[PDB]
Write a protein that binds this ligand. Structure first.
Ligand SMILES: [K+]
Ligand SMILES: [Mg+2]
Ligand SMILES: [Mg+2]
Ligand SMILES: [Mg+2]
Ligand SMILES: [Mg+2]
Ligand SMILES: [Mg+2]
Ligand SMILES: [Mg+2]
Ligand SMILES: [Mg+2]
Ligand SMILES: [Mg+2]
Ligand SMILES: [Mg+2]
Ligand SMILES: [Mg+2]
Ligand SMILES: [Mg+2]
Ligand SMILES: [Mg+2]
Ligand SMILES: [Mg+2]
Ligand SMILES: [Mg+2]
Ligand SMILES: [Mg+2]
Ligand SMILES: [Mg+2]
Ligand SMILES: [Mg+2]
Ligand code: NA
Ligand code: NA
Lengths: 76, 97, 50, 100, 93
RNA sequence: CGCCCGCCCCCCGGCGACGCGCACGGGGACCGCGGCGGGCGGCGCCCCGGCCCGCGAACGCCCCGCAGCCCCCGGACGCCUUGCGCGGAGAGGGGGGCCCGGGGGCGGACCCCGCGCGUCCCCGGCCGCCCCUGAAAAGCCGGGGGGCGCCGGCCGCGCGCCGUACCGACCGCAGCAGGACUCCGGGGUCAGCAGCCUCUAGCGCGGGAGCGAACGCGGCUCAGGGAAGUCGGCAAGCCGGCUCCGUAACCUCGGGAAAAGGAGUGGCUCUGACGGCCGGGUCAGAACUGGAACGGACGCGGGGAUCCCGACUGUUUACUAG
RNA sequence: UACUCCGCGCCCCGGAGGACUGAGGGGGAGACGGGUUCCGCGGCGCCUGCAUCUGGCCGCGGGUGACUCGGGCCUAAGCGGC
């Protein structure tokens, strides 16, 4: 597992290297109402935490239908 | 818990220098054993027995080619001080000889 | 022990499969007088040496 | 910093059918509260008042932990109503009373 | 000599071996624990490593010497004799 | 010295790869104390004084990492350890590089908060010791010379054979008070891993009842005397922890020596001393007070004056001789 | 060092009480040796030096999964071949 930057996220999605994308909404503690993007790659699992929930919609909408997407949004 | 005693992780229980462990707490609130591997020595000088700078203490097979080299004519075989003596000695000898 | 060769393991395997009684239909088919197999062994009493 | 402004309540509404009146409870708390193992100086910073549904303890500039409120409630119930009830957290300030 | 009158370093033996052995050991051990001047750099940093092996803690040069002491008198006599016999030959070739 | 990764041959090297020790320092785990949150017990009187729970791996990337070793400027009675040790073959100072079985942050994974003595394991730099110097090879890598030439990135596939239950259930003719290698090791009292009580875990083992003779086996007490007993002080008894006082003849000058021999020691309430920009225990002194009592169980030298033999530590007739 | 009451029986199981081993363990696991003693169901003809409804006993069925743990490779003291 390793951390990834925003610019080389949708790039990886551009080269068709991601196998799946998961969106999870964190709303407790130091993870204050932020979301984590976890992309499954052949070698590693890459995760990015956009600083605000709004940024998640844009990027995910920027790769919609390019990689299969999940949602979690645990509220417990 | 009131008991923290563990059991051996190896094939046998004889404690040799290649059978050392340390203890750590796991996410399931359990105490586990992890091997302590031997640390190899880094390459040492030929003329002197001192250690050569710039190379880590890992087996060479797990290093990239750049990580096991030094950028000098005899790099990795002798130190900078030992190289000067050979250069000075060869020049001064071949000038008189 | 728990660290054996396959050769020893195969000879002990045959000993276990052979520790059986005489079947009931065999006793009456052959009209047997002695109905016990005296080649059986018990682990607590025997020395297999295998 | 002991800024106080702390709130604590005990939802006794669940024992409404039985005969536990909140005024005697409030007097017990007032009479047997302790600060620094000393019973003086308590009216200065500790106030407990009967409300509609629970006794409410409001403090100014003073601090203490919910455990103490649980301890006092159990001592009162030991005076009368022993064997029945229980004192269970329900939020970050309040408690409750439910039968065994 | 604030702690003992005469035993010195042989005080580690208690009363266990006799006077002659202890005197001889006093001499030999005092000699073998000492620091010697290095013939290559004139510093007192030579110490014994094994029976006849002496090492300098400054320059790191190893020498073959005597047991218990760096130099022996027979060796000095022999070196002087060799040096003398070497010059006489080189004058007449 | 860094950063982005060429192979084959001859030669030169390295890693694998190594003793013991009293101390000193660092990391981890364990342990304890305080705070906050959740749960429980008992309650004649007290009780914010009791108990339980509060978790974070391998691996990837970035920072930090003492001591050690090295580079630049320049040109010295200084630097520094518990101990040492180092310097014109270049110290101190200022500025840098390398290694460090480790730590922090972010990921793995929507992490209650602080503090401290000790214990065990591992590592580090030193110092000490030897008529004792504390394995080898497969395998892997580097350098020099020569000859050759994509060598890395992404994506896919693959990884054969054998062991694997359980046990002191093993050997002693037995389900025999014998013998049988190793690993993990909490709390209190304490110098202590000793003795005594205990949390966790495990568990009531060739059967029971009555009675309370002799005698036996294992224990306890005993007036006055104190070895008169006996081949023979055999057996039992005396002493014993810690602190202070005081210690002879003789001697291979190292010892003898805990010589011999005296005095104190509980509880409670106080006083002083020793660090750091709260912590910690230890040492010393005083008043009061208990049947003239305090190492209150436990644990734990009886001593002295001489003669013979062997210098001493060591070894020996497994099953009658140490 | 040691059992008792009730279900139910001094010995099995359950609840309650009272004790013990006492972290060099009557604890938790391996090496060697043993070889199925392991697990479930049933049983008391033998054995369990008293009893037994218990059992390492008797009958019937089951149970041991590896690219990463060990062996297979290396060499030691040695042994063999030439
Ligand atoms: K297994
Ligand atoms: Mg390097
Ligand atoms: Mg197993
Ligand atoms: Mg036999
Ligand atoms: Mg036995
Ligand atoms: Mg007499
Ligand atoms: Mg007589
Ligand atoms: Mg006696
Ligand atoms: Mg003798
Ligand atoms: Mg002796
Ligand atoms: Mg004998
Ligand atoms: Mg004898
Ligand atoms: Mg006990
Ligand atoms: Mg097992
Ligand atoms: Mg069974
Ligand atoms: Mg059977
Ligand atoms: Mg392996
Ligand atoms: Mg294998
Ligand atoms: Na003990
Ligand atoms: Na019980």
């Amino acid at each position: 597992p390793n951390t990834i930057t925003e610019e080389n996220l949708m790039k990886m999605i551009a080269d068709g290297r991601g196998k799946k994308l998961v969106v999870k909404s964190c709303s407790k503690g130091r993870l204050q109402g932020k979301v984590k993007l976890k992309l499954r790659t052949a070698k590693y699992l890459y995760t990015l935490t956009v600083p605000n929930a709004d940024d998640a919609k844009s990027i995910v909408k920027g790769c919609k239908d390019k990689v299969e997407v999940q949602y979690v949004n645990d509220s417990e | 818990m009131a008991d923290c005693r563990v059991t051996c992780r190896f094939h046998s229980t004889y404690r040799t220098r290649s059978k050392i462990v340390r203890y750590k707490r796991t996410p399931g609130n359990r105490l586990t054993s992890l091997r302590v591997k031997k640390l190899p020595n880094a390459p040492h000088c030929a003329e002197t027995g001192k250690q050569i700078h710039g190379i880590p203490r890992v087996i060479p097979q797990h290093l990239t080619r750049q990580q096991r080299k030094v950028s000098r004519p005899y790099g990795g075989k002798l130190c900078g001080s030992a190289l000067r003596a050979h250069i000075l000695e060869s020049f001064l000898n071949e000038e008189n000889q | 022990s728990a660290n054996k060769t396959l050769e020893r393991k195969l000879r002990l395997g045959k000993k276990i499969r052979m520790n059986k009684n005489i079947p009931r239909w065999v006793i009456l088919k052959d009209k047997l007088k002695k109905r016990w197999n005296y080649k059986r062994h018990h682990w607590r009493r025997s020395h297999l040496k295998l | 910093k002991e800024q106080g402004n702390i709130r604590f309540a005990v939802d006794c509404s669940a024992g409404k059918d039985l005969e536990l009146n909140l005024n005697e409870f409030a007097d017990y708390v007032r009479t047997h509260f302790k600060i620094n193992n000393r019973k003086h100086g308590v009216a200065e910073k500790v106030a407990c008042s009967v409300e509609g549904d629970s006794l409410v303890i409001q403090t100014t500039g003073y601090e203490f932990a919910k455990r103490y409120v649980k301890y006092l409630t159990k001592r009162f119930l030991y005076q009368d109503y022993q064997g029945v009830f229980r004192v269970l957290s329900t939020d970050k300030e309040t408690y409750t009373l439910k039968p065994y | 000599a604030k702690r003992t009158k005469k035993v010195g370093l042989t005080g580690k033996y208690g009363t266990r071996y006799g006077r002659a052995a202890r005197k001889q050991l006093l001499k030999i051990e005092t000699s073998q624990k000492a620091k010697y001047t290095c013939p290559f750099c004139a510093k007192d940093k030579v110490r014994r490593t094994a029976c006849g092996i002496w090492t300098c803690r400054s320059c790191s040069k190893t020498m073959a010497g005597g047991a218990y002491s760096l130099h022996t008198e027979p060796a000095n006599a022999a070196r002087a004799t060799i040096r003398r016999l070497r010059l006489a030959r080189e004058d007449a070739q």
